[PDB]
Amino acid sequence: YTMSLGAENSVAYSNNSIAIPTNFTISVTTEILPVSMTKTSVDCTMYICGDSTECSNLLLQYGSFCTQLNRALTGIAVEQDKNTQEVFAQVKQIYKTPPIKDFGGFNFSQILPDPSKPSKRSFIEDLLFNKVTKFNGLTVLPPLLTDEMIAQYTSALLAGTITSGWTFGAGAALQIPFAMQMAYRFNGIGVTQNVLYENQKLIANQFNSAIGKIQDSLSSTASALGKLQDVVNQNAQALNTLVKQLSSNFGAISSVLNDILSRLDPPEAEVQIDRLITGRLQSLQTYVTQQLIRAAEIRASANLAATKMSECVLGQSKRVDFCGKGYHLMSFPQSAPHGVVFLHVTYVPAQEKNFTTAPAICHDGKAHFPREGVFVSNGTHWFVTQRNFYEPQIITTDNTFVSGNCDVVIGIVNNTVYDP
Amino acid sequence: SALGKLQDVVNQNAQALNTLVKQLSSNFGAISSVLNDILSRLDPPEAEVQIDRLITGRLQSLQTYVTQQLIRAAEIRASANLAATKMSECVLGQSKRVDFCGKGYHLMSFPQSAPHGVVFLHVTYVPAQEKNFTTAPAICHDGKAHFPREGVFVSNGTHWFVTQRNFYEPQIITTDNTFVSGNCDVVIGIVNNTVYDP
Amino acid sequence: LTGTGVLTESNKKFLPFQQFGRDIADTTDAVRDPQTLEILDITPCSFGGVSVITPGTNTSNQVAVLYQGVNCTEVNVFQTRAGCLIGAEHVNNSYECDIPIGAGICASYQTSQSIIAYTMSLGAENSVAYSNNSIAIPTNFTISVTTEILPVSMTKTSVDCTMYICG
Numbered sequence A: 001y002t003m004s005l006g007a008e009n010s011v012a013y014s015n016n017s018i019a020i021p022t023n024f025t026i027s028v029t030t031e032i033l034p035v036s037m038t039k040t041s042v043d044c045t046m047y048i049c050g051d052s053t054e055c056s057n058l059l060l061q062y063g064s065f066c067t068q069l070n071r072a073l074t075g076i077a078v079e080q081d082k083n084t085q086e087v088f089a090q091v092k093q094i095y096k097t098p099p100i101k102d103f104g105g106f107n108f109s110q111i112l113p114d115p116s117k118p119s120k121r122s123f124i125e126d127l128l129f130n131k132v133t134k135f136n137g138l139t140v141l142p143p144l145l146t147d148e149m150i151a152q153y154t155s156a157l158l159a160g161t162i163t164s165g166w167t168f169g170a171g172a173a174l175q176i177p178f179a180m181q182m183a184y185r186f187n188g189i190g191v192t193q194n195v196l197y198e199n200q201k202l203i204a205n206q207f208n209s210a211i212g213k214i215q216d217s218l219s220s221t222a223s224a225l226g227k228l229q230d231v232v233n234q235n236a237q238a239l240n241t242l243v244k245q246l247s248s249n250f251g252a253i254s255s256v257l258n259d260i261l262s263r264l265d266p267p268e269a270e271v272q273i274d275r276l277i278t279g280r281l282q283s284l285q286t287y288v289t290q291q292l293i294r295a296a297e298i299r300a301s302a303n304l305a306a307t308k309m310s311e312c313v314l315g316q317s318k319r320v321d322f323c324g325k326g327y328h329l330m331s332f333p334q335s336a337p338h339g340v341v342f343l344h345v346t347y348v349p350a351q352e353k354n355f356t357t358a359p360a361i362c363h364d365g366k367a368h369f370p371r372e373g374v375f376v377s378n379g380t381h382w383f384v385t386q387r388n389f390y391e392p393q394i395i396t397t398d399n400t401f402v403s404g405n406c407d408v409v410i411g412i413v414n415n416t417v418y419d420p
Numbered sequence B: 001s002a003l004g005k006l007q008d009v010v011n012q013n014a015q016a017l018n019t020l021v022k023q024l025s026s027n028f029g030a031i032s033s034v035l036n037d038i039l040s041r042l043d044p045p046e047a048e049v050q051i052d053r054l055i056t057g058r059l060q061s062l063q064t065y066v067t068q069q070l071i072r073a074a075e076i077r078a079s080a081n082l083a084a085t086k087m088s089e090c091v092l093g094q095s096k097r098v099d100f101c102g103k104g105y106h107l108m109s110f111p112q113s114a115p116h117g118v119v120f121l122h123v124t125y126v127p128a129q130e131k132n133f134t135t136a137p138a139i140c141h142d143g144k145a146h147f148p149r150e151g152v153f154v155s156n157g158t159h160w161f162v163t164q165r166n167f168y169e170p171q172i173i174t175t176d177n178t179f180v181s182g183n184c185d186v187v188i189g190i191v192n193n194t195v196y197d198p
Numbered sequence C: 001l002t003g004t005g006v007l008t009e010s011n012k013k014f015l016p017f018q019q020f021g022r023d024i025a026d027t028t029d030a031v032r033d034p035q036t037l038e039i040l041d042i043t044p045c046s047f048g049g050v051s052v053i054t055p056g057t058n059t060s061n062q063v064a065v066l067y068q069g070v071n072c073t074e075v076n077v078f079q080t081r082a083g084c085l086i087g088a089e090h091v092n093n094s095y096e097c098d099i100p101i102g103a104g105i106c107a108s109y110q111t112s113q114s115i116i117a118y119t120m121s122l123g124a125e126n127s128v129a130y131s132n133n134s135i136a137i138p139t140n141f142t143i144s145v146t147t148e149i150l151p152v153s154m155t156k157t158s159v160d161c162t163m164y165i166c167g
């Protein structure tokens, strides 16, 4: 069939009709981002020839390709280390959560680590690590920061976030209750703090329900972490191809260097050795080029992940669709194998309701424009409410400002302002 | 070791050039690296094969050099795009992105010319000398809850004041910096206080 | 079938018609004795990499060696997850990372001057006194101008293929 671009919809657009939401919902999303790869090391001589003095002497006539490839692999390893370094190691002091989890009703026990396990990882981190699933010159180097250290870094970031908001990124960590932190987060997008101070229970229940839904999804679906598994599979296929490229003859008698050396004298086997060396060197150069391209891609991804960390966890960004889809409130980092997982808590308005609007009101000849809000009407009476939450207020002189006359504005309606 | 990145780039370019000019001393399986000596000694038929092998080796070396240079140029292009974005967002304005133009509240930046690069002087605002205080979400005076417009209700032990969020400036609680929306028993943590009316 | 390796005893079952053996990567890992009927598993010879952890020459000349992927039995000594570090002592205290080694292991030249090995510390421990009625408002500030190096370009070169290859 032909793919559908989406459901059809026709917005009821007019010149005196506005839609103001009367409710909202908390939506916690999930964004997977690759950070680093498996630091591999390919011994050039051992891979090309392999414990062969004559073949090594023949390979030495090609220049410094061995040193070039070794330097490239070392640079790739150092880059994969510095990527996760700059991504996770961003906080100076390691913070911890207080024993009294008095967070105003929010339940973070599912994202905070528990001491009833060797590795201090949370339930989400355990799910993420459980879902993601010597040689002939091939050896893998272990990363500098272990999984336990990455989990400790994520726990310190989470504790600093919960305890400070965004002050732990600029200067020093400042204590602040999570209720007032969420009030500041709401004030940072256009919603007043009274909405939170009145619906804290509903917001905490919605957050707990979203966390539970995320847990259920991560426990049910195994294809959640896609890009990490794709990178792992690409690295595995590259390694398997590099290994299988040793069973090829490349025009020689056989692919076994020791068998060639035992069957033919050096003067006659020099040609076969040269063919094998050229073939394996071309294959290794192609592998190194592809690995450099993939390392550049992973570096770009790690830079993006570090930027998202600094702009969502250590502060509330105003960039649209950056810290998740919707009005960004806060974000929680989660460790993942060779990657990072963010939990973008967004603000999504719901229960839309259409009303009648007007640009201004003309009370006594002079026009009155609202300072912060929009003039709405429920059919007979006019009120001034917020932009993202329907809160009708009586139109007074403290909610509007006068600027000129009302004979230049097109669409102004007549109303009676109130003087307190 | 202040300008480390520029020095590393220069050293990488120098090492690439040195490797490119040293790859000519290898025979790649031929008689020798010098072409004139081969042309003088060997007969034309074998000299053709020797020249073909030398050309293949040098072309492979040059292609590897060009590939590495293209990767390095892509990295330099990414760095230059980042630097141009930082310039346009912090030198020609004031950015609100955290940890993008310095550790702290960004104020202004001053660009400086550097060899094959640029240096920014990120002037940031960093608070210091904090002090513990007791806070409250709202206060009730005559049965109606009072929420601060821009500020935080802090108390030194006996009296409540409203101060800024980044600089302790205690001010008396008046009706000009607070807005009333609702009642007392709608928020958990509200503390009874007195609101002044000028 | 020639080669070098450690001929040990295997626990696999060779079929009566099978003589040689192979692995998943098209490599011979087990054979059958010509004289007797025993199964000899061909494990590869001991090998690895060599890394030299050395401080600046202005400080001292004492160096250490790190053999990658060894059990300190095929080559004062200490077993890490990245290999054996022969030349440094493993202390029980945690310091800041100075010379990266691998799997959280770091090295630094400390005073009795000698190279040591320890587990890197992620940072100074801190515990903010969080409470539902406690806030910390700063009373002062300090302007701190920072620097940031960013490359913008590099040297523009051009190599003529003709003059390079065929001079």
Ligand SMILES: *[C@@H]1O[C@H](CO)[C@@H](O)[C@H](O)[C@H]1NC(C)=O
Binding pocket: A022, A023, A024, A025, A202, A206
């Ligand atoms: C808003 O929606 C939630 C469900 O997500 C509901 O519990 C709540 O009562 C709604 N608010 C209003 C004012 O209807």
Ligand SMILES: *[C@@H]1O[C@H](CO)[C@@H](O)[C@H](O)[C@H]1NC(C)=O
Binding pocket: A101, A106, A107, A109
């Ligand atoms: C958080 O949730 C867990 C299980 O979902 C529960 O055991 C715990 O009591 C909850 N804590 C709070 C403060 O609601």
Ligand SMILES: *[C@@H]1O[C@H](CO)[C@@H](O)[C@H](O)[C@H]1NC(C)=O
Binding pocket: A012, A017, A354, A355, A356, A377, A378, A379
């Ligand atoms: C909202 O839209 C419906 C359907 O278009 C309409 O019947 C109703 O009058 C509108 N509301 C107002 C306040 O005009």
Ligand SMILES: *[C@@H]1O[C@H](CO)[C@@H](O)[C@H](O)[C@H]1NC(C)=O
Binding pocket: A378, A379, A380, A381
């Ligand atoms: C509009 O709201 C006012 C006050 O809330 C009320 O008195 C009036 O009856 C409402 N009109 C309609 C049509 O609902």
Ligand SMILES: *[C@@H]1O[C@H](CO)[C@@H](O)[C@H](O)[C@H]1NC(C)=O
Binding pocket: A015, A016, A410, A411
């Ligand atoms: C809105 O548009 C309709 C149709 O174009 C028109 O009749 C009406 O006068 C307009 N109202 C205003 C306030 O512009």
Ligand SMILES: *[C@@H]1O[C@H](CO)[C@@H](O)[C@H](O)[C@H]1NC(C)=O
Binding pocket: A362, A412, A413, A414
């Ligand atoms: C508002 O009152 C003025 C007073 O003369 C009148 O001219 C104008 O038409 C009125 N507006 C509307 C929409 O009727």
Ligand SMILES: *[C@@H]1O[C@H](CO)[C@@H](O)[C@H](O)[C@H]1NC(C)=O
Binding pocket: B130, B131, B132, C129, C136
């Ligand atoms: C605040 O109280 C905590 C714990 O009581 C203490 O460690 C700290 O020094 C006090 N002062 C500040 C500015 O945090």
Ligand SMILES: *[C@@H]1O[C@H](CO)[C@@H](O)[C@H](O)[C@H]1NC(C)=O
Binding pocket: B140, B141, B142, B143, B192
């Ligand atoms: C706060 O004051 C109101 C009257 O202004 C009174 O009804 C209420 O009981 C007081 N609450 C407390 C906790 O003192």
Ligand SMILES: *[C@@H]1O[C@H](CO)[C@@H](O)[C@H](O)[C@H]1NC(C)=O
Binding pocket: B156, B157, B158, B159
């Ligand atoms: C709190 O501040 C007020 C006004 O500055 C002062 O009168 C009072 O004595 C102070 N109390 C304490 C405990 O410092």
Ligand SMILES: *[C@@H]1O[C@H](CO)[C@@H](O)[C@H](O)[C@H]1NC(C)=O
Binding pocket: A100, A102, B188, B189, B190, C132, C133
């Ligand atoms: C803060 O939490 C404590 C429990 O440790 C409780 O006794 C107190 O009433 C709480 N304060 C507020 C304002 O909720």
Ligand SMILES: *[C@@H]1O[C@H](CO)[C@@H](O)[C@H](O)[C@H]1NC(C)=O
Binding pocket: C071
């Ligand atoms: C290294 O020695 C330890 C101690 O006996 C042993 O547990 C471990 O399996 C050895 N490593 C390998 C790869 O066999």
Ligand SMILES: *[C@@H]1O[C@H](CO)[C@@H](O)[C@H](O)[C@H]1NC(C)=O
Binding pocket: B129, C139, C140, C141, C142
């Ligand atoms: C703030 O710190 C500066 C030094 O950074 C000092 O000169 C000044 O006196 C301090 N101000 C206060 C009020 O402590």
